[PDB]
Design a protein around this ligand. Sequence first.
Ligand code: K3S
Ligand code: CL
Ligand code: MG
Ligand code: MG
Ligand code: MG
Ligand code: MG
Lengths: 194, 194
Amino acid sequence: KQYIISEELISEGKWVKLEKTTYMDPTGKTRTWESVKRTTRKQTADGVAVIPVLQRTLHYECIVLVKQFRPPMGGYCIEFPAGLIDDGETPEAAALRELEEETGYKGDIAECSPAVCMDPGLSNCTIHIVTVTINGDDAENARPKPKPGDGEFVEVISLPKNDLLQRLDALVAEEHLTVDARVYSYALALKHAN
Amino acid sequence: KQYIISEELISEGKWVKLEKTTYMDPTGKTRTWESVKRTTRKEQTADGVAVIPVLQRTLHYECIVLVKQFRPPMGGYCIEFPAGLIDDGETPEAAALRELEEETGYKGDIAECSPAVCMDPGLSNCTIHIVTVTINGDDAENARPKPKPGDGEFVEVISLPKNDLLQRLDALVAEEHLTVDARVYSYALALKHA
Ligand SMILES: CCNCc1cn(C)nn1
Ligand SMILES: [Cl-]
Ligand SMILES: [Mg+2]
Ligand SMILES: [Mg+2]
Ligand SMILES: [Mg+2]
Ligand SMILES: [Mg+2]
């Protein structure tokens, strides 16, 4: 019943543009919306985010996260490892690549979401959420070698899965970090389950 | 180590702006970023709230109450937690219970309220509080709940059992063109993984 009529370019950078979207509301009334898009998409989605489950025998299972300075936020954020999918790369392959670059861990694919939206009231940005397990007992994950690209500066933060939400709250309380909403969503459901 | 040097406006809409952000990298080198911000944030501790609404009813499995709306940025229908912006002077908890009632009809009870968490920190400064609310579906207030959508809001309510949320979401994605929100998907995945 609702649909896009036209999109007016307002402003286009190298990485992001702003559009004025005209759409038909269900009553038959034309309306406008200010919409953001990335200029980099081809792809199933803009990006992947990786849920990396680090499994070591006789240890708690951990979720591997990354801490980085995020210029739009003006501060440091705690996030699932993540990056954009390369032209002609699959979401799975992007997940394992990003995970290795950002963490040095080598992982195995467990499952892969459909494209999911990041902030659909503002942008068209989408990602695949990719669950990956990491055999922390294998020699290739003993001393994980992180290969950052140009301009990535990533700290790795592993947190036990069974206390994830309490551990994150503690970091926010002590370290003036912002937690990512998808990380927080996942942590909450771990507590809310059953 | 890293910090913001300057923020130059590139383009300002009614609702959204684009900025050229200059910052210092941890090598001591100046770099830039293209940053999105909303124009509507005043003294709120965040832009908005998203509500995790746990519908509880005697001799029913708990349901997660979700909303389906057309999102102009996305050009299509999206399934999301009930959400909206925090009005000036409004508490995150008040915004949550208000938005929940407006979008679903349900009158909730506060359970917990997150710190401000980032929506897409590689792109925007946008933040929310994630507010968990329980709905006493045995109360007569919540028996045959009617939305009170504001102007240009057109919302369908979808309640899904917590104990099968991921499959039930997958089944809706299989049946029509719609996108699940990444925070919803993350929360459903944790429910499976716990
Ligand atoms: C470090 C390379 N710059 C990437 C980027 C992404 N956006 C939105 N602006 N700059
Ligand atoms: Cl798993
Ligand atoms: Mg990244
Ligand atoms: Mg990366
Ligand atoms: Mg809303
Ligand atoms: Mg609303």
